[PDB]
Design a protein around this ligand. Structure first.
Ligand SMILES: CCCCCc1cc(O)c2c(c1)OC(C)(C)[C@@H]1CCC(C)=C[C@@H]21
Lengths: 219, 215
């Protein structure tokens, strides 16, 4: 279990500054080149910075002058100090251990950085029930529409985690500085409304959690 | 600076099928500094192949790699479901270090028609002053699909936003969500709302509708 754990990522304004940390364990940190990479929302991978065992740093022109990689060989921690941030710095940041042939053999789970002027906003959570006139058979599909939140992420579970099969939770889409996603669940027709169905939506950045029970639409 | 051009961009393979993907560099690069990473959806990339042809830790033997110069390839001897992922090549013989844009591998399976469902605006949302109509198109194959909205039987294009899931790990299908958003006032100037899915699994569209004044 060599391990790398990134922390510190979050929402910051354009022009802001932010420091990421990477805690290394299970190997001798002082004997390795260590590296930050990032993955853009478009799923593109980009080299951000390297730092030799001896503290020599290297950067692509994209962040040169703005980011500073540093290391503490004594607590086994790697840092990325970000400043002069732009929206294009928005990405998931990876801490990576480098080899002598310039491969990355150990990667962290990543920490997410969002650079935006949009304000933190809790989601409105609306139920999706079939129209009052909908017709039956076998399976029903229900839903939760989770709308107008910022920033990513939210997490949705159904029935505090009990219902998990037959779930599709769709990636969020952004419009005019707000996010919307929906989630669908499919359960046996007799199973509803008999078996209560509730979606649970948690929004970390807002200290928001809400639950919405999906009630049949009625005259 | 080295540009790495991967192809194809996206590839679908039958179980058991032999698969080859390619990485093409803008100038000759050293093969000891050419590596491949595999990234499964919702996970970090992982080192897959190092130094052109060396399999990394844990990597099954059906994988291999080769090349030199401006031209490198990764081969999977027999496609397995667990191999569904995006593959990236990366060069480290020149600064700045650079990556290919990735090749996405998907699994082939039997055609399956979407299950389609439409949902009216909730009262909660109308109170706030807005109206979202949602259509789910679930568990279909292949991934190409087209959705058309109509209001009062006329085609409607603005205010629509679509989202797609990644290929499903359990059944290898795809799913889609389509949300048409209106103001409460506009929503209240019309009665009939429809979503139609066109997919190769049928010769007519799947059509789901509702009426603003229904019971
Ligand atoms: C995912 C790719 C990870 C690559 C890790 C990696 C490994 C590595 O050995 C180096 C890396 C990057 O960056 C450069 C800037 C080439 C450093 C020059 C100085 C020294 C001692 C090593 C270089």
């Amino acid at each position: 279990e060599v391990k790398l754990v990134e922390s510190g990522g979050g929402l910051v304004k354009p022009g802001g500054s932010l420091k990421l940390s990477c805690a290394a364990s299970g190997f001798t940190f002082n004997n390795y080149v260590m590296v930050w990479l990032r993955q853009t929302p478009e799923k593109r991978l980009e080299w951000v910075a390297s730092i030799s065992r001896g503290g020599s740093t290297y950067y692509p022109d994209s962040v040169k002058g703005r980011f500073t990689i540093s290391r503490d060989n004594a607590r086994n921690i790697l840092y990325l100090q970000m400043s002069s941030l732009r929206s294009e710095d928005t990405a998931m940041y990876y801490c990576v251990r480098g080899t002598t042939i310039v491969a990355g053999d150990v990667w962290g789970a990543g920490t997410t950085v969002t650079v935006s002027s949009a304000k933190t906003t809790p989601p409105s959570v609306y139920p999706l029930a079939p129209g009052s006139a909908a017709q039956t058979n076998s399976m029903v599909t229900l839903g939760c529409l989770v709308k107008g939140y910022f920033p990513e992420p939210v997490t949705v579970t159904w029935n505090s985690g009990s219902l998990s099969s037959g779930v599709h939770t769709f990636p969020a889409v952004l419009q005019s500085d707000l996010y919307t996603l929906s989630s669908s669940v499919t359960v046996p027709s007799s199973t509803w409304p008999s078996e209560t169905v509730t979606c649970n939506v948690a929004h970390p950045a807002s200290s928001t959690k809400v639950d919405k029970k999906i009630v049949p639409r009625d005259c | 600076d080295i540009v790495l051009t991967q192809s194809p961009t996206t590839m679908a393979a039958s179980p058991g099928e032999k698969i080859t993907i390619t990485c093409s560099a803008s100038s000759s690069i050293s093969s000891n500094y050419l590596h491949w990473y595999q990234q499964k959806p919702g996970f970090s990339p992982k080192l897959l192949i190092y130094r052109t042809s060396n399999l990394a830790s844990g990597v099954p033997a059906r994988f291999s790699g080769s090349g030199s110069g401006t031209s490198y390839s990764l081969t999977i001897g027999t496609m397995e479901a667990e191999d569904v992922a995006t593959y990236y090549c990366q060069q480290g013989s020149s600064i700045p270090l650079t990556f290919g844009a990735g090749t996405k591998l998907e699994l082939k399976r039997a055609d399956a028609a979407p299950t389609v469902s439409i949902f009216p605006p909730s009262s909660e949302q109308l109170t706030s002053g807005g109206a979202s109509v949602v259509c789910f198109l679930n568990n279909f194959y292949p991934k190409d699909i087209n959705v058309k909205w109509k209001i009062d039987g006329s085609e409607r294009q603005n205010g629509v936003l679509n989202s797609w899931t990644d290929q499903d790990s359990k059944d290898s299908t795809y799913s889609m969500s389509s949300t048409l958003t209106l103001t409460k006032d506009e929503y209240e100037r019309h009665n009939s709302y429809t979503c139609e899915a066109t997919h190769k699994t049928s010769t007519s569209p799947i059509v789901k509708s509702f009426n603003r004044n229904e019971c």
